[PDB]
Paper text:
The eukaryotic chaperonin [name]/[name] assists the folding of about 10% of cytosolic proteins through an ATP-driven conformational cycle, and the essential cytoskeleton protein tubulin is the obligate substrate of [name]. [name] is the most complex chaperone system identified to date. It has a double-ring structure, and each ring consists of eight paralogous subunits (denoted as [name]–[name]) arranged in a specific order. Each [name] subunit consists of three domains: the substrate-recognition apical domain (A domain) and the ATP-binding equatorial domain (E domain) linked by the intermediate domain (I domain). Here, we present an ensemble of cryo-EM structures of endogenous human [name] throughout its [name] cycle, with three of them revealing endogenously engaged tubulin in different folding stages.
Importantly, for the other open-state [name] map derived from the same dataset, we attributed the extra density in the cis-ring chamber to trapped β-tubulin co-purified with [name], based on our biochemical and MS data. We denoted this map as [name]-tubulin-S1, which was also in the NPP state with consecutive [name]/6/8 subunits loaded with nucleotides in both rings, indicating that [name] can engage with the substrate in the NPP state. Overall, substrate density appeared to locate right above the central N-/C-terminal tail density of [name], and associate with the E domain of every [name] subunit, mainly with the C-terminus and stem loop of each of these subunits. In [name]-tubulin-S1, nascent tubulin could potentially become stabilized by its engagement with [name], leading it to overcome the first energy barrier to reach a lower level in the energy landscape. Still, the tubulin at this stage remains quite dynamic, accompanying the dynamic nature of [name] in the NPP state with only [name]/6/8 subunits preloaded with ADP.
Numbering used by the authors:
A (entry chain Q): 28 to 242, 273 to 529
B (entry chain g): 20 to 241, 268 to 526
C (entry chain H): 18 to 524
D (entry chain a): 14 to 533
The structure:
């Protein structure tokens, strides 16, 4: 049952072969809750596309490992794996054993880890400059929200530069996302601290209280119990009563309404104020710690900002604007993709050119190694190089250009020693261009973990030859 | 593209039939006749000849093979396999969305490189040495009944083509149909067979009054009113006093009354090709009619005239001590089955001498010639600027099927030896490290007699690629007349 | 891949086919019945798609674009629908021929910006052109909308009412603010114009010879109390056997109504309005203290009064005070056709008004109700944007020559795609030829050739079966709204061609 | 009805798809299945439709369409069917758009008038023979697919002078060229660059005996088909001889007749004697004494060209029904010099400055016959290309240049007429784009890009007449890029595209007028 598992994994490649690259197609996703969505991120397709074939579930579980130590290259796991098994049939139909292919890819997986550092063209200067981030971040945002790479490359650059001085503390949790219904990308901006969309329900515009609480004459004494405990900021989960709204304004207690539960639990882990279920009990232990709680009006919309003036501050929140909730979700993923791009660059910085440049340069070397390396494993090392070529083919098809002219021209420039050459991103131009001058640079550490996972997944599939049901 | 793909499966299935019918360990096949009978042959030439096929693309494979049988009596099995394997790479036709013209230019470009690569591993031959030619012709004598008289078949096959070759004209043309007429004579055994150094006519003896044995013959090539011309056309021939009257058309019954009166041999139904060999043998001349004969139409220089009944059958021996651009084989045998074995097996060996004498160049067979070629095109593809390099590499991977079948028919591990066979051509010289057809392991061809001529492989790869070009140039089937 | 896109091409055309015969003022009507069996007949394209509730996924893409065209403009959403569908129709044979769908998105994004550059370069500013007062220019553009109708003979009278309704409002214009009443009887020239808010005033109960209809600065009370005696809201009945207890019971029934009525006098209400009816017994208490009482007011008319007088509508009577009582300057009653009509003119927040039509038939007011909504928006968008272009599908014929002539110099795959974008814009005037019963063959073949001869504003004449300079005929449409529609249709088509495979969660 | 319109369009449309992919010189082959089962393979569009048997009435209308194109032009009939197919396919959509065929027919007839006039307004006369090159470039580009293309300039120059040698008008300023082209010879010159051009006919024969001089300056050339050897009455009827003594009489008497023939033949003074059947050995001796240049067993087809060269009469037999005469002053031509040159392994007989020959000969000297054979087909085919162009009194640049230029003019002309015929002329010109759109697929290039490049340059030709605009841009398939035919030399005649669009527009009208099908 090997040919059936391979053919089943090729069914999954076509669901993400076209969604890859800047000219990639979108996919008409329909949620399980009877909702319509349109996107091109491969991570979101598999979350809704229930992959029931067990043979391809290993590839999806490999993409789950793509979350740890990296936040990019998911399409590499889906395309590179599908091309290895697709060409694996050409070896098995000749008569080659499945075991010699398994040990052949482990040889090429190590060989590529030794050739990849030689192709590192440049590295991040780590000067914490906005022009440094936005210039290098031009690669990761595109193919996720294409055309709007100008504003996004500069916004996230402002959020990451604020955290690098706090060395050893940069993570994706520091840069949160907060989107508001608005006109479009022109009104989007970046602010410090925690920023939410719901404005202050009460009359307080600014209060420097420390304790924050999260949840006719009787209710007037209960709101006073929040003040008796030394807290002038009350956060109600659901709706607030009309009588309780005014009682908070008498003692200058800032009323805040947070309907989304993600807004409530976000405060539990930052200032320490946890949500109590009872109707405002006088519990001081479960209250938080904040330096200043004030109201800000940015983008013609009032927003509650929790700025930690006394502390150093490491909590960033990008204020996004967009008229469509479906479109703002596509921007939500590109923001998380850009934040995770530099989260890997906190380690040793190494950058490789994208756009199929390294994939031909890496295949040109392994192919030459397979010609001079005798043994029964060379057939698998050769196709491991030709499997890299499918990633240029993914971009050539999405760009509307014949992939045959792409692989010929990428091989010709590298044959003459012209490295750092990738695909020209244009439909009317089947030629190529230099990736170094264009500013297209991927992450070295992402490819090291991506080629490692895609080979282990393809080996994990080839090791299986039959599926048998069971019962505990 | 449905018509482009139809010619793939139409030829891929035909190659599957004769895929295991290659080499000295060729596998037999079972053909069910409509009358319940079974033929258990193994030659791919006769197998596909009787199998009726429905697709037109597969029918062209049969018309191509028959023309190959006239040029060279062997190697036609690989002609269809390479043309079928070259077209079996559907990744570059449809999946890559390439045009057929893209791949045709790639194969035509690879054709000129394969021709030069086979000449690099060539080797000259000293045709003067009969022992060096014995190693070449023995490739066909092995696994035959003629192995008991291999030295006799070598003398019959090698010396016969030397008589047909005329090296004074420059072109050195060799024709087996006109100048190498093979005939049988009853009686005797395979040992009694020899090559007649002249012409032999298969005309039976009708009248008893005919010159039986003459050491210096004389050959003449060419109621009331009815017998007027008959007696006069016959009386003009005896002016020269001949001993055998050789006529082109048939002779009447009354004209033979004067041929038996003269007690001379009467021969008729002789082709125009047959009389020229005689005119060049005994120096005679072909006259249009019997009435305008001259002195030059004589048999001066002839060996002898013998119409003896050998094996209960007359045979007119008009041989001489010269080689007038022609020859005649005398096959002797006790039965027709034994005669049928030597007659057909010598035609396989006689055609090998035709390829060496026209161009004394050999190639290392037994899977050695393919790997020597496929290794040259693979390295050349890495430096070939253009999209044609991808189908250029498919030819390097497709020609490996010839040694794949020889090792698979033997039953050994084809995947283990073929992968290591690449290393022998990668490091060491490509002219050696072949594959043993009987044993299955690797061995050098300089020590073995698996060397094939040059003309056999040239027509193979030319026709193997030309067949794929003609089939990929098709894109639709037209019905009508 | 390829076939999923063709399924979306046809899945969107049926949506365009649902509103294909609604383009233009003289479009066709439909009949969409809901689950309750209610009849809804309207020629507006936006209202058709709101009630269809198409569950197809690729169809809802254009529904979201049409709703955005309605939220911002409120008109012309059909033109976004037919154009978005035709971009998919002309590229249909090119999709199956092996051309990539992403290449088409670059073509529409290329041709869309090329149209805005040509629209802004060709649009003409009209503020005080030809030395004409703007009242005449707004009357000229408005009267052309009313021609070829039942009121064609007295259109000059009705043409002057619209310019008075807009100038009475502030700089902020809104089509919903100007209400239109329908009253059967009388001629066409007897249609009146009220600058304030008015209602039918079906109150025919007692209160005669009192309740003066004039007030200086009256306090308009907005209640929802039924002051009837035998009311379903107020009542009193206690079943007992004692006889003397019944006298106190009948006194308690009159006290429930009367005690609530004293709150109306103590609150300071001078003109008391109530949605529920008021009985003849309660009208006399208002008549004894010299108070104006007029009920049976619809709830919709009070919402226009709440925006006009500046008060608030209270359900309870105990909450009646100076906080909710509005004010006005001129409150007077008229006798339009003999029926009573109260109205408040000269309010502080007089953003709304009222317009009562007249005629001897109910259907003549229906066609007049539709034409007035078209004449107001022309005056609304003429002052908003003085840079406008010719109407009647004229602007669509300009781009057909420019984008085509521009595509003839753009080598590559963008040629036939931007060139097909030109032929795709011919759907707007072709429907005006069919939706008006004209021959689209003679018009488009004569109209497209007029532009090469020197035409720059010639368009489809909806009145006569011929070509006419719609700019000289004062048939204008905004230049920016045409750009907002083309940008909306290009975004609508590019989202469909960007899709190549449908993914559905199994549920 | 309309259902009959749709079924008749697909019938004629599918006929074009049979010869669609086979368009151009890089056309794909196709299998022709006859009634028996044989398979004839070819890419020629004309031969496909002659054997194509499709039982449908609308398809047989396209057969008669090809017959007039075969007699009028004799080439390019494959393009006549594809243009007509697109008009019906485009006209089919108009019928669905509530358009009548009469409005479409009335528009197509006018569109054909402006097409012929626009071509005539952008013609180029027959010129550039000497002093300007589209001559060297005309032949050098055509012979690229053969081995001869190594040194194209050396082999292309010999084609220029060959066309001018075969130039004779003879009718009111006709200028055309004959069917008999330059007879191409070959030999072993140890290299391909040794090809020598001879401005004169070359006979590949030898005189035999070396004693005869190889320098004959006598203008009289004796041309005969009668053999001077033993003359037989008939090869089917032999003279009966009842005596061997009588045989020697006729034997010796025949040699006595040649003693009278040898004197009467040489009585004309012609030293160049050519015999078809052969010359007797005793008769060759008398020519060594008198010094005449005799050749035996000359090919009759080669002698027919020599008789046409010097103007000699082909003498069938010396017996003029009463005796035996030599036809003095009838079989004699006029030449200046006949010298048997010493070429490699072949003493060729060169003839120069005859009465009127208008021909030449090319000695394709090479290393082996494998190259000389491939070189002979390249020049023989390259001659027909330049011969076809410089005969047509006026020519036009072809190769996608004519059809792409009409796409803009006839589309702009449609914006001036109107009158319910704009869509017909709009789609008539759009249908002509299929010719380059089809040739791009056969050239293994992107079909949508190359057609747009032609119209990108052809539109600028009409926007302004400035020299910056790229004008007369054809489409070369050997490179897959537009090229200027003025520089490349890709020219076509005038009457071809005229008659091609003429019948293609007329045949589509004939099928468009068919609304119902009545059978019996
Ligand atoms: N501008 C671009 N040009 C070429 N390739 C790109 C570009 N942007 C992204 N890609 C490629 O598409 C694949 C997916 O990119 P990305 O969205 O950054 O990662 P993921 O899909 O895993 O989130 C990556 O391998 C990347 O190289
Ligand atoms: N002794 C041998 N050892 C190895 N290979 C052989 C031997 N004899 C023949 N072959 C291989 O078998 C193939 C077919 O040979 P042959 O039978 O002569 O032609 P065909 O199979 O077409 O009749 C040849 O290509 C040759 O390489």
């Amino acid at each position: 049952a090997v040919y059936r598992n391979i053919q089943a994994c090729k069914e999954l490649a076509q669901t993400t072969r076209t969604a890859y690259g800047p000219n990639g197609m979108n996919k008409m996703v329909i949620n399980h809750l009877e909702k319509l969505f349109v996107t091109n991120d491969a991570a979101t397709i598999l979350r809704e596309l229930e992959v029931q074939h067990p043979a391809a579930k290993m590839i999806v579980m490999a993409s789950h490992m793509q979350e740890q130590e990296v936040g990019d290259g998911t399409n590499f796991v889906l395309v590179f794996a599908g091309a290895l098994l697709e060409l694996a049939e050409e070896l098995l139909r000749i008569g080659l054993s499945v075991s010699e292919v398994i040990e052949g890819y482990e040889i090429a997986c190590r060989k590529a880890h030794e050739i990849l550092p030689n192709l590192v063209c440049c590295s991040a200067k780590n000067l914490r400059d906005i022009d440094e981030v936005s210039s290098l971040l031009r690669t990761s945002i595109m193919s996720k929200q294409y055309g709007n790479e100008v504003f996004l490359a500069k916004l996230i650059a402002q959020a990451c530069v604020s955290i690098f001085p706090d060395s050893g503390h940069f993570n994706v949790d520091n840069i949160r996302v907060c989107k508001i219904l608005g006109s479009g990308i022109s009104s989007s901006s970046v602010l410090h601290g925690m920023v939410f969309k719901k404005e202050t329900e009460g009359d307080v515009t600014s209060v420097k209280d420390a304790k924050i609480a999260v949840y006719e004459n009787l209710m007037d004494a209960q709101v006073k119990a929040i003040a008796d405990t030394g807290a002038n900021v009350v956060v109600t989960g659901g709706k607030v009563a009309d009588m309780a709204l005014h009682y908070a304004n008498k003692y200058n207690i800032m009323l805040v309404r947070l309907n989304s539960k993600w807004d409530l639990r976000r405060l539990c882990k930052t200032v320490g104020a946890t949500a109590l279920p009872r109707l405002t009990p006088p519990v001081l232990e479960e209250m938080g710690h904040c330096d200043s709680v004030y109201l800000s009006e940015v983008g013609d919309t009032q927003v509650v900002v929790f700025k930690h003036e006394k502390e150093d501050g490491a909590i960033s929140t990008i204020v996004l604007r967009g008229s469509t909730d479906n479109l703002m979700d596509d921007i939500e993923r590109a923001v998380d993709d850009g934040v995770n791009t530099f989260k890997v660059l906190t380690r040793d910085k190494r950058l490789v050119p994208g756009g199929g440049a390294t994939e031909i340069e890496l295949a040109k070397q392994i192919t030459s190694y397979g010609e001079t390396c005798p043994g029964l494993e060379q057939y698998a090392i050769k196709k491991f190089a030709e499997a890299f070529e499918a990633i240029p083919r993914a971009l050539a098809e999405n760009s509307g250009v014949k992939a045959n002219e792409v692989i010929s021209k990428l091989y010709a420039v590298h044959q003459e020693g012209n490295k750092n050459v990738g695909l020209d991103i244009e439909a009317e131009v089947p030629a190529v261009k230099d990736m170094l001058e264009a500013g297209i640079l991927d992450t070295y550490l992402g490819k090291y973990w991506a080629i490692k996972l895609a080979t282990n997944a393809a080996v994990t599939v080839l090791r299986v030859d039959q599926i048998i049901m069971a019962k505990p | 593209r449905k018509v482009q793909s139809g010619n793939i499966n139409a030829a891929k299935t035909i190659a599957d039939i004769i895929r295991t019918c290659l080499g000295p360990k060729s596998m037999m096949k079972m053909l069910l006749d409509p009358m319940g009978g079974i033929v258990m042959t193994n030659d791919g030439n006769a197998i596909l000849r009787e199998i009726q096929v429905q697709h037109p693309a597969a029918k062209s494979m049969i018309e191509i093979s028959r023309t190959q049988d006239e040029e060279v009596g062997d190697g036609t099995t690989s002609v269809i396999i390479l043309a079928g394997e070259m077209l079996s790479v559907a990744e570059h036709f449809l999946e890559q969305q390439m045009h057929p013209t893209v791949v045709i230019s790639a194969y035509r470009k690879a054709l000129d490189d394969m021709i030069s690569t086979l000449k690099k591993i060539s080797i000259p031959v000293d045709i003067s040495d009969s022992d060096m030619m014995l190693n070449i012709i023995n490739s066909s004598i092995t696994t035959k009944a003629i192995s008991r008289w291999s030295s006799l078949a070598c003398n019959i096959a090698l010396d016969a083509v030397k008589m047909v070759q005329f090296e004074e004209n420059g072109r050195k043309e060799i024709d087996i149909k006109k100048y190498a007429r093979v005939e049988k004579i009853p009686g005797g055994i395979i040992e009694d067979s020899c090559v007649l150094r002249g012409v032999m006519i298969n005309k039976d003896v009708t009248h008893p009054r005919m010159r039986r044995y003459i050491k210096n013959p004389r050959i003449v090539l060419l109621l009331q009113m009815e017998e007027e011309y008959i007696q006069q056309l016959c009386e003009d021939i005896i002016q020269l006093k001949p001993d055998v009257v050789i006529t082109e058309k048939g002779i009447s019954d009354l004209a033979q009354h004067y041929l038996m009166r003269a007690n001379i041999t009467a021969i008729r139904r002789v082709r125009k090709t047959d009389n020229n060999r005689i005119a060049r043998a005994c120096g005679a001349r072909i006259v249009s009619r019997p009435e305008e004969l001259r002195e030059d139409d004589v048999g001066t220089g002839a060996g002898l005239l013998e119409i003896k009944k050998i094996g209960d059958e007359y045979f007119t021996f008009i041989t001489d001590c010269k080689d007038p651009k022609a020859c005649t084989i005398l096959l002797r045998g006790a039965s027709k089955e034994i005669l049928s074995e030597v007659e057909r097996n010598l035609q396989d060996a006689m055609q090998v001498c035709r390829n060496v004498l026209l161009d004394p160049q050999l190639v290392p067979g037994g899977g050695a010639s393919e790997m020597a070629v496929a290794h040259a095109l693979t390295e050349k593809s890495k430096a070939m600027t253009g999209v044609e390099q991808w189908p250029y590499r498919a030819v390097a991977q497709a020609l490996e099927v010839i040694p794949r079948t020889l090792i698979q028919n033997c039953g050994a591990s084809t995947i283990r030896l073929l992968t290591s066979l690449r290393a022998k051509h990668t490091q060491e010289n490509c002219e050696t490290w072949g594959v043993n057809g009987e044993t299955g392991t690797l061995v050098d061809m300089k020590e073995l007699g698996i060397w094939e001529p040059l003309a056999v492989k040239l027509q193979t790869y030319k026709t193997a690629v030309e067949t794929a070009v003609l089939l990929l140039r098709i894109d639709d089937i037209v019905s009508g007349h | 891949g390829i076939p999923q896109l063709v399924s979306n091409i046809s899945a969107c055309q049926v949506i365009a086919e649902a509103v294909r015969t609604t383009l233009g003022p003289r479009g066709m009507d439909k009949l969409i019945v809901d689950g309750r069996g209610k009849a809804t007949i309207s020629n507006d394209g936006a209202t058709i798609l709101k009630l269809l509730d198409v569950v197809h996924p690729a169809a809802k893409t254009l529904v979201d674009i049409a709703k955005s065209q309605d939220a911002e403009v409120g008109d012309g959403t059909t033109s976004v629908t037919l154009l978005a569908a035709e971009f998919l129709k002309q590229v249909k044979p090119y999709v199956e021929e092996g051309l990539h769908p992403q290449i088409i998105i670059r073509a529409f994004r290329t041709a869309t910006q090329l149209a805005v550059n040509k629209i802004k370069e060709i649009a003409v500013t009209v503020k005080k052109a030809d030395k004409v007062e703007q009242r005449k220019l707004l009357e000229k553009c408005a009267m052309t909308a009313l021609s070829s109708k039942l009121i064609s003979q007295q259109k000059a009278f009705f043409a002057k009412m619209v310019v008075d309704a807009v100038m009475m409002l502030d700089d902020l214009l809104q089509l919903k603010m100007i209400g239109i009443k329908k009253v059967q009887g009388g001629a066409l020239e007897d249609s009146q114009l009220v600058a304030g808010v008015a209602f039918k005033k079906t109150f025919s109960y007692a209160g005669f010879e009192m309740q003066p209809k004039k007030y200086h600065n009256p306090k308009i009370a907005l209640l929802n109390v039924e002051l009837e005696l035998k009311a379903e809201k107020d009542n009193a009945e206690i079943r007992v056997h004692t006889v003397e207890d019944y006298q106190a019971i009948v006194d308690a029934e009159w006290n429930i109504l009367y005690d609530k009525l004293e709150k109306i006098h103590h609150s300071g209400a001078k003109v008391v309005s109530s949605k529920l009816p008021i009985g003849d017994v309660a009208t006399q208490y208002f008549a004894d203290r010299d108070m104006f009482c007029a009920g049976r007011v619809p709830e919709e008319d009070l919402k226009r009064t709440m925006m006009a007088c500046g008060g608030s509508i209270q359900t309870s009577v105990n909450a009646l005070s100076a906080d909710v009582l509005g004010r006005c300057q001129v409150f007077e009653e008229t006798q339009i056709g003999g029926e009573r009509y109260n109205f408040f003119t000269g309010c502080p927040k007089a953003k709304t008004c009222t317009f009562i039509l007249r005629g001897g038939a109910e259907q003549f007011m229906e066609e007049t109700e539709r034409s007035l909504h078209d004449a107001i928006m022309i005056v609304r968008r003429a002052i908003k944007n003085d840079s406008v272009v010719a109407g009647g599908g004229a602007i669509e014929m300009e781009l057909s020559k420019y984008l085509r002539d521009y595509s003839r110099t753009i080598p590559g795959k963008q040629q036939l795609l931007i060139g097909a974008y030109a032929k795709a814009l011919e759907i707007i005037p072709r429907q005006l030829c069919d939706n008006a019963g004209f021959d689209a063959t003679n018009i488009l073949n004569k109209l497209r050739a007029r532009h090469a001869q020197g035409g720059t504003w010639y368009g489809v004449d909806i009145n006569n079966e011929d070509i006419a300079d719609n700019f000289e005929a004062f048939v204008w449409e905004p230049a920016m709204v045409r750009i907002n529609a083309l940008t909306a249709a290009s975004e609508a088509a590019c989202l469909i061609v960007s899709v190549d495979e449908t993914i559905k969660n199994p549920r | 009805g309309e259902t009959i319109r749709s079924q008749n369009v697909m019938a004629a449309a599918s006929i074009a798809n049979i010869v669609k992919s086979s368009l151009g010189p890089v056309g794909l082959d196709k299998m022709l299945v006859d009634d028996i089962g044989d398979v004839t393979i070819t890419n020629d569009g004309a031969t496909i439709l002659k054997l194509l048997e499709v039982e449908h009435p609308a398809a047989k209308v396209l057969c008669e369409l090809a017959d007039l194109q075969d007699k009028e032009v004799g080439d390019g009939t494959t393009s006549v069917v594809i243009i007509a197919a697109e008009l019906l396919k485009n006209a089919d959509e108009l019928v669905k758009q509530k358009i009548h065929p009469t409005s479409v027919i009335s528009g197509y007839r006018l569109a054909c008038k402006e097409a012929v006039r626009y071509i005539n307004e952008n013609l180029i006369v027959n010129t550039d023979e000497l002093g300007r090159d589209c001559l060297i470039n005309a032949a050098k580009t055509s012979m690229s697919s053969k081995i001869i293309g190594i040194n194209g300039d050396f082999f292309a120059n010999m084609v220029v002078d060959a066309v001018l040698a075969i130039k004779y008008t003879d009718i009111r300023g006709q200028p055309r060229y004959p069917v008999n082209s330059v007879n191409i010879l070959k030999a072993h010159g140890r290299s391909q660059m040794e090809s020598m051009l001879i401005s004169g006919y070359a006979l590949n024969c030898v005189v035999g005996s070396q004693g005869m001089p190889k320098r004959i300056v006598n203008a009289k050339i004796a041309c005969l088909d009668f053999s001077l050897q033993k003359t037989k009455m008939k090869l089917g009827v032999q003279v009966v001889i009842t005596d061997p003594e009588k045989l020697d009489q006729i034997r010796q008497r025949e040699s006595d007749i040649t003693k009278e023939r040898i004197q009467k033949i040489l009585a004309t003074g012609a030293n160049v004697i050519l015999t078809t059947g052969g010359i007797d050995d005793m008769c060759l001796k008398y020519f060594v004494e008198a010094g005449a240049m005799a050749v035996r067993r000359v090919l009759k087809r080669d002698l027919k060209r020599i008789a046409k060269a010097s103007g000699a009469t082909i003498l069938s037999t010396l017996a003029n029904l009463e005796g035996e005469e030599t036809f003095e002053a009838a079989m004699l031509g006029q030449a200046e010099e006949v010298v048997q040159e010493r070429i490699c392994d072949d003493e060729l007989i060169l003839i120069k400055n005859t009465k009127a020959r208008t021909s030449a000969s090319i000695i394709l000297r090479g290393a082996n016959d494998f190259m000389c054979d491939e070189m002979e087909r390249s020049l023989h085919d390259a001659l027909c290309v330049v011969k076809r162009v410089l005969e047509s009194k006026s020519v036009v640049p072809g190769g996608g240049a004519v059809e792409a230029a009409l796409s803009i003019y006839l589309e702009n002309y449609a914006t001036s007429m109107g009158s319910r015929e704009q869509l017909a002329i709009a789609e008539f010109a759009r249908s002509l784009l299929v010719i380059p759109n089809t040739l791009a697929v056969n050239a293994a290039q992107d079909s949508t890009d190359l057609v747009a490049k032609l119209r990108a340059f052809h539109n600028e030709a009409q926007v302004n007449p400035e020299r910056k605009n790229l004008k007369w841009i054809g489409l070369d398939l050997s490179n897959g890029k537009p090229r200027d035919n003025k520089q490349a030399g890709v020219f076509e005649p005038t009457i071809v595209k005229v008659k091609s669009l003429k019948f293609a527009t007329e045949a589509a009208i004939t099928i468009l007028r068919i609304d119902d099908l009545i059978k019996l």
